[PDB]
Subunit: 167 residues, 6 copies
């Protein structure tokens, strides 16, 4: 039913560093910030943990166990606090980090909104079975990205993946 106050706590999962992926993330935030059902949105790449005991932090380099633990935990905490996950899923360059989080969230029985993106719309539509079945709601990033703004995150109505070939 209608919520008395915003209840949606979003874990915004998404790959980063890549030009198009950052743009998607940025646009996702705007859209979500426009959603009245959202009480909070957590994006893993926003703020980060700084290990004072880490000389020259190499983004993409080895990285200390403390930073790794703290960063990984910040994400698990976001997943823990969240009521649902929204994943800007790159269908051209699959991100195992995001896939990991999708699996983790489904094991917690939390709803997962898949927002698939492809720069090759002409190519065959295929999806790993685990993603196609694990995801509870799909919102095409290429055609329905805007929906993230209207989607009722207080209840996260499901929408099973369909139309994708499965290997």
């Amino acid at each position: 039913m209608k919520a008395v106050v915003p209840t949606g706590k979003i874990y915004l999962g998404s790959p980063f560093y890549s030009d198009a992926q950052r743009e998607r993330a940025a646009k996702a935030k705007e859209l979500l910030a426009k959603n009245p059902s959202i009480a909070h949105v957590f994006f893993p790449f926003d703020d980060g943990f700084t290990d004072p005991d880490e000389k020259n932090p190499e983004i993409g380099g080895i990285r200390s166990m403390v930073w790794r633990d703290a960063t990984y935990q910040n994400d698990l905490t976001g997943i823990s606090n969240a009521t649902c996950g929204v994943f800007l899923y790159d269908m051209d360059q699959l991100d195992d980090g995001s896939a990991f989080e999708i699996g983790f969230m489904r094991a917690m029985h939390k709803p997962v909104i898949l927002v698939p993106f492809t720069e090759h719309p002409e190519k065959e539509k295929k999806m790993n079975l685990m993603i196609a079945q694990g995801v509870t709601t799909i919102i095409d990033g290429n055609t329905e990205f805007e929906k993230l703004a209207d989607y009722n995150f207080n209840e996260c109505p499901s929408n099973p993946v369909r139309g994708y070939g499965i290997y």
Copy 2:
């Protein structure tokens, strides 16, 4: 202690095929609506999923796998987002769907408010052990229905089932 904002998110479980069951649900919603500790209430039968590929869907009839998965997931999603469960539990015609849900919620360690209803208030009081022990708070539907309007859903104070024979 006193909450700054309503935090109770209720998964209102209930059978919904008899007139009496739906009337209780209606009444439950009204009472819950008057509780200042509630941020949101989810009732499984309020919306529903529509499978476009499902021709002439009938209730009680063979449903498409897609509709089944979508609908079942909407309930698990409601359970996941909820902080507690409130079950309008029909003691005369046991509902296995509600029982399944109570079990699911308890496995998740979530408090479960049982609200038993019987059209035979004078008959023997017996309850299955799993329900009697599984529920954390009991509010008699026959004589205490109305406290749903005042119960503190921010903390869901416990009230063990007592006075029922166990078989």
Copy 3:
């Protein structure tokens, strides 16, 4: 693939107040006993807890909180130790204890084998959505009871519920 040793640990859930229910349980045990994939089977009604402080305990009567907690925990313990659930599910007199258990087990992501029994094989086939979608494998009790003797409990191959109307 082929297991070096039986690994299937079955939580055999079942009502156990009618003669027909206990006869199915008896039969189920015998069949399960012949399955080489089974390492262990737990039946909730086999042993039992005795509360010394409980004077003249009667079945269906008011039981001590200690007995209730001990007995309920023995079942949750059985569910925890089990790799899968096998429910001799009475379709004529729905058992909420079994339903609660099926829900509990599924919340734990454990496979659940439903073995439906009805004294009216010719009547309508209807099942609650939560049970129909919650169970992972269905083995008709009326006509396929005996495959419990051969089912591979090391892997519990899935067999979705189909052919039942959903209400």
Copy 4:
């Protein structure tokens, strides 16, 4: 990242026996009460009454009271988004430890707020508590950080500087 509404739901776990512990809990509540990221705080000692219990604190309690009270706490843990533990380093509270392990098994964040009146002793911590806790806020030197900590996201802060037994 900025919350539209406070979402932090705190389970304030803590021993409530010595006067010192009672004082810490009192302060914590006051401090948490000023944190704008908190929507609710649950303190287990703010109880259930067994109408059939003819009862002495520390005495034999009825199983009903025991069940109801234990559940009230698990319920608080279930509803909570994170745990804040006024952790007595001098008189170890196994109840609090239990709850910490419980919360972590649920993958929830745990903010450890240790207290020690014996600075003279080597700062040591059980491995399980050291690795289980996700954020540490020294109760003797950083107690006040509870009024500002962002419980909407519970930023991690691994335990360090503590010898592990």
Copy 5:
């Protein structure tokens, strides 16, 4: 029912370093090794992880994050693999590590066997509510230590804590 092969996988939780505590642990192993229902016993202090990148490992000293992570995980893994936990619980010098594991295991719905030990049998019998309620079976270390040898770990029958004052 009777298991076809040993099914009990024990997570043997216990404090260490202390003279009496090591002795208890040593005796526990002997007793358990004599139990036909046990398939495996994991004791956290037996073998350990060696961090090649750890200069002079100080047992009780700071210790690297890698060692801490690996060691902590070895314990969580033992808890994960185990079907039940057996805790040699020191009532004189409370161990929060053990209490942590008890809470962790109960959250996973696994049975927990408490084996309390005290060197001051004359002192008041008291137990924290969380331990007294969380534990599913108590076997007095001081009087029934031997039972660990007969206890059926394939089913872990419960035995609620009683007789202990609760603060």
Copy 6:
């Protein structure tokens, strides 16, 4: 610590598309088959048949087949005590990653067995995989360790030497 009977129940997760992947899975099975600590190994590709599916691999599959097959895998994960993932570092398999995250959320141990045919590229790993996995066994240089690894206790071996993106 010595098991009375093998208790290791392995969920052998892995892509099964390229011939190289098919070869690795084939070897892994053979290797695991010699490990005395293993009681059972589950390989998802060893399938369900939808009698109502009139079916092409890679094509649109019926929802029944999808559900049954996906569940067969979750069932394998549920029954498993640990996961062994023939992790293709060249062509990332999101299915395997999903399963790894799923298993860790269940607190189960995950043995990562990475494979790369491009040693020339900087050994890098997504943080989630690097921190999620509990034990790593290089598939290109330690593949054989699978026949000796003690799956009864799955000893930890944190991921190191991998740049984290």
